[model samples]
Target: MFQPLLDAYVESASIEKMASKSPPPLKIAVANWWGDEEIKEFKNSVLYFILSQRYTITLHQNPNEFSDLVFGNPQNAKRVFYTGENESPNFNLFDYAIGFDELDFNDRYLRMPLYYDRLHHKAESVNDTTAPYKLKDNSLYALKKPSHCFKEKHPNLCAVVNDESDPLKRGFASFVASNPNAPIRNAFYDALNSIEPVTGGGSVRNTLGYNVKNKNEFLSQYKFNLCFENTQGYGYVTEKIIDAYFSHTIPIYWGSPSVAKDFNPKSFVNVHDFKNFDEAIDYIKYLHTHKNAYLDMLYENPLNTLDGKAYFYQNLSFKKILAFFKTILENDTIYHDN
Candidate 1:
C-alpha cells in the first residue's frame, strides 16, 4: 500500500535543478576485474544497501565497458564505490575509486583502507545483550573462554583444533598459525612457551579456509580472538574484529590505535599498548584467572557507552546513505559550465 506513495516521494525528492534537491537514485557499476574476496564482499554489501534504499544499480562486468563508462564520463557517477588493493594496475581506469573505509564513511570519493583503519560509521552499530554472551534465547548452549594455551594433552584439544580446521579450521589460535612466514611467529611461539603451561591445542595448519557457520562455532567457545594484521601498522581494522564481536567474543586487538578514527576502542582490548609481550600475556592470564572480571569485560554492553540511543540513532544504513546521495546531487551538479 505504502510502496506506491514511497516511490513517488523518492522520485519527487530528486529535483535535479534545486540545490537542495536529492540526487537521482544512486546507480553503481562493479569493476569487471577480479580482486580479493574482501572486494567481492564489499560489492555485495553495497548491493544490499541499494536494494534496501530503493536506489538504482547497474553492473558492468566487461572490463572494457566498465573502464570506458567510469573514466569517459565521471560526471555520470555521482558516487563510484569499489573494493580491492591499489596495487592492481587496472585501478588506473576509474576517476573515483573508494576502498572499504571510504565507502563506510558515506562519501563521494574513495579515501580510506578497509584493513587500515578501525571500525567506523554505521558499520560499528551493534546491540549488546544484557546477559552473558549467550544466544538470544535461553538455550542450553553456553559461551565460555578457551584455556589460554592450547592443551596438547587435553582430550578436548583435538576437538578444538578439528573444530577450527573443520570449518575452515577457523580459530583464534589459527590466526597466529597463519603467520609462520613472518617474525611475529617467533615472537608468538616464544610468548606461548613463556606463558603458564596451559597445553597446546594441536596444530590446525592443515584445516580448510574459514566458513561462516564454523567460524561462529569457533568464536562462541572463546572470549578473545587475535585480530592482528600483517605489518600494516596503525589506523587499520579488519574483518577479524567484526568476526570476534558478532561471534560473542572479545577481540584482543593488534595493529593501529587509529582504528579509533571512526570508532571508540574502549569497546575492545588492544594488545599493542602493553609494556611488553610478557605484560600482554599477563593481562590475558589475569582475565582468565578472575572469572567475574573477565565476564564483566565481556558482558559490558557497548550501547550504554555513548548517550544511550545516540549510537543507534547515528548508525548509517543503506537508507541513510541513499539520503546522502539524494541530498548531494539535488543541490550540486557533478560539473559546471563556464
Candidate 2:
C-alpha cells in the first residue's frame, strides 16, 4: 500500500508520475510469468525499471487496464522478457530471458539471480534517484553503510538526525517472516525470546499490537533481523538479506553458504560462523551488553569487506544489465511457434 513510497524513493521507476509520451521506437514485453497480474503491470517487472530507460514496454494485456499512452502490441513484440519464475523461459517461444537459473546461453541468458532486483533497487537507493519520504527518513540510507560504533554514525546519510534520539540506542532483534512453521526460524525465535522478545512486528508470533505493513520500515528501529532463507543453495541469496541490508539492521543469517562471498562477514552474525546457535546467541548477548561492540557492526561497510564490491558492482552492474538487454533489444532473432 505504501509502495509509492518506493517511487518517492526513486524517480526513474516513476510509475506514479509517468504520463503519455511518444512511444520509443524500440519495444519490449514480459511473458510466461507466474501470473497475468504480475505480467500485466509495469511496476512488477524489473525489465520495466531497466528497459524503461531506453525502450518502451508493451505488455500482453488489455490496453484499457494499463496506460494506452504508449503504442505497440505484446504479440511478437521486439523482445520478450522472462525472469525469476519457476517455469523456465521457453526459448522456442521467447526472444530473450533474464532469470535466476544460472546458465551460460550467450545472448539468450542474462542471469539476474533473483536478489539483484530488490537488492540493488533498495540498496542502490544511493544509485537510484530518490526524494526521502519525510524531510529525512533514515530508511533510504541503508544502501551505504558509512560508519562504526558508539559513534552512532551521522543520521543524514544521503546528503541528508538526532544524537539523543539515535536509532542505534534501541533494543534487541526482529523477525518478520510471513511464513510460519520454519523449524530453525521458530526455534531460534523461541531461544532468543528467552533473552528478550524478538519483536519482529509481523503477525507471525508477534505480540505487538500493530501489524507491520512494510518490513523495511519496521526493521529500521531494531538492531537485528532474523534473516533466514526458506531455501538454501550456492549463489541463491534472496530478498531475506536484502531487506535486512536496506533496513539498516544487522541480520542473523542462515542460508547460502556463499554468503561470505556476497556480503561482509563482520557486518552480521552468521549462524554458520559459530559451532552452534548457542555460541552465536552468546555473541548476540555479548554485543547487546557492549554498546560499542553492537554499534560498531551496525556501522560496518556491508559492501566493502570480502570483495562484496567486486562481486556486486563488477559481476552484476547496471551497465551489464543494459548490455544484456542491448543484445535482446538489438537482435534480429525471430522466435516462433509450430
Candidate 3:
C-alpha cells in the first residue's frame, strides 16, 4: 500500500526552489475561453501536473502584444492549443497541441487530459492518496485507502456489524450528473433504482434532499459511483471515473472503450463489459449481496497499469512536458493550413 502520490507532491512542494533566474523569460498569450479555465495561475492548470521546474514569465497573457508562444484551444486559433474537455486537437488549428489523445506527432503535442489533472485537484482537497502532483513514467503504483464504504453498508454484507452508528447507511450506490440530458445515466438510474435503490444525486436524478454542490463531499458517503462520460469519443476521457476512484468508492464507468489503458479493469466495474444497463445492473446487484468479492476489487489500486505502464502517469509526466515545450518554443514552428 505505497501510493507514492506524494512522490509527485513532494516535488511540487519544491517548485519555488526549482525555478531559476538563468533562462530567458518565457512570454505567453491567450485567447477566448470560458471564465473558470484558470490559465493565468499556471499552478492551477493541468500543465502544472507535468511541470515541476519553472521559467520566468516575461509577459504572461498580455493583451497589448502577443508572444512567440500562446495558449488557447481549438475554439479559436492560437499557438498552443490545450483541451481539458473530452476533445481532440485541431492539428491544423495550432502548431503545438495538448489534449485527451495520445498521438505521435513528433513531439508537437502533450496529452494531459482531465483524468491526470484530477491528481492536482485531489492533492489540494485531501492530503491522502491519489496525491501525485507529477506522474512518473516508471509506472510506480501503490495500495491506496481501500473503500471504507462497507463499514457502513452491511454486516460487512454479513460481517456481523451491529455497530449502530451509521445504522441507516443506505449508500449502495450514487450517481451525480450536471448534464441533465444524459440518456445513458437516465436509463441506468431507472434500472438500478428498481433493482434496489440508488441515490441519483444530480440534475439528471436527485433522490437526495438538496442538489449536490460538492461531489466529493456528497459521494464520500456512498459505495459505488455511476461515473460515465456525457458522450463518446475515441480517446476522450474525463474526471468522472477517476473522481470515483479518489473517493475510495467503486465506479460503474463507461465512455472510453480503451479505459483499460489508464485504470486497472479489476478495480472498477466497467459497464462496457456488459451488453446493456440490464446486464450491468445484474452484476452490480450480485456484488451488493456478495461483499467479499466486492471488497476484493474495492481494496485494489485502480491506477495499477495493464503492463506496468499506464496512461495516467507513465505516459504523461512533467519530464515529458518539459521536453515538449522545449521544442514548442524553439521556433514556435508555423504550420500550413491543411
Candidate 4:
C-alpha cells in the first residue's frame, strides 16, 4: 500500500526543501472507529504530555486527513499513528504507531506498550555469551497505596478481590464452578467451595456478579491478583499483572512462567507450572503466611531500581514510538533521551 508513495518520496525527495529549521511536531492519526472514547482520552493525554515536553505533536481522526496533520505542519510535525483496531494499514501514512493493544507478534507496523497490550518474551539462555543483552529472569512491581476494602473487610473468607462492593456476593469464587469450562476449573471450584460453599457453576455473572468498578477498587488492596492469558501459546500477557504490580499487589499468575522468567520473578508469584488447583492454592497460602520471605523476595528500592517507568520508557510509550518514527523519517538512529 505504501509502495507508490514511498517510491515517490524516495525518488525525487529534496532534503533541503523538506528540512525545517524548527523541531518537528509528532503527528498522530487515530484510525480507530470502534474505541472512540478510549482513543479520545489517550489522544488528549498524549497530546498534553508531548506539548508539555516542548515536542510538537498532532492528533487526527482519519487516514485521509494525514496531509493536514503531517505535511501541513511539516516545519514542526513528527508523524505518530494511533489506531484502535488490530488491522494492518498503509504504513506510508505515518511515522509511528500507538494503540490499546497489539495483534500477533508478526505485525510489522504495530508498536504498543506491553502494559496496554500483551507480549510474551521468547526463552533465551542468560549464560549464553553470544546473546546481545542479558536475560532478565524476574518480574516487576510498581507499588501504590492499597485499597481500603481488602484491608479492613473480608478478613475471614478467602476473598479473591474479584469485586469488593458487597464483599460476599460479587466475587469470582462466589460460585463453586461457574467457570467450569475453564482449564482445571473444577479444582479451583472445589478449593473455593471447601472454604465457602458456592451454588452456581457455569455462568460468569452468576459466578462473579460484581460491578467492574468495584472489582477495580478491590484489586488495588489485595496482596494477589489473577493474571490469565487470552491466548494460551501466543506469549500474550495482559494488563492485569501490570495493574497488580502498580497497585503493589503480587500477581497470582496462570500463564507462561517464561514471561516472568524473562523478567524479575521475585516481584510476582507465578503458578504457571503448578499442576491442579489445590496445589496452586496451597502454595499461595504458604506465601501469604510467610510474610518476611515474600517481602524479601520483592524488596525493590524504587529510587535505584528499574520498574514500570523504566520498562515503558525502554519498550513502550508515545516517546518510544516517536524514536522509532524519527529513525524512519531521518534515517538516523534515535532514542527518546531528549
Q: Count the backbone clashes (under 3 Å) in each candidate.
A: 21, 1, 3, 20
Q: 1-338, model 2: which lDDT tens digit per residue? A: 11222323333222222257553744332333325565444455455666565556554434234231222213444444554433455676555666555457787766665666674355344332342222133432333443232122223322111233555565688888767857777788888888887885776778687778766656766778888776555555677776776666778898666677666677788887888888989998898888888777776666532332223523564557768766765666656453
Candidate 3 residue 1 C-alpha distance from true site, Å? 8.9
| Global lDDT scores for all candidate models | 0.41, 0.58, 0.62, 0.39
Candidates ranked by TM-score, best first?
3, 2, 1, 4
Model 4 regions lying over 4 Å from their true place: 1-23, 32-35, 44-55, 68-111, 114-216, 233-235, 261-263, 275-278, 297-319, 331-338
Backbone clashes (count) for model 4:
20
Which parts of model 1 are misplaced by more than 4 Å? 1-27, 35-43, 46-52, 63-81, 84-97, 100-186, 193-213, 260-266, 302-304, 310-316, 323-338
Candidate 2, run of 10 with poorest lDDT? 153-162
Which residue pairs does candidate 2 place in steric collision? 149-296
> Which ten-residue region of model 1 has the weakest summed lDDT?
121-130
Q: lDDT by residue for model 1 over 31-54, one digit each (tens)?
A: 434445544564455323344335
lDDT, residue 62, candidate 3: 52
User: Compared with the true structure, what per-residue lDDT tens digits does model 4 show for residues 163-272?
Assistant: 22222123332222123355643445456456544333224424345433334334533445555443343233444554444333456565444554233555665666
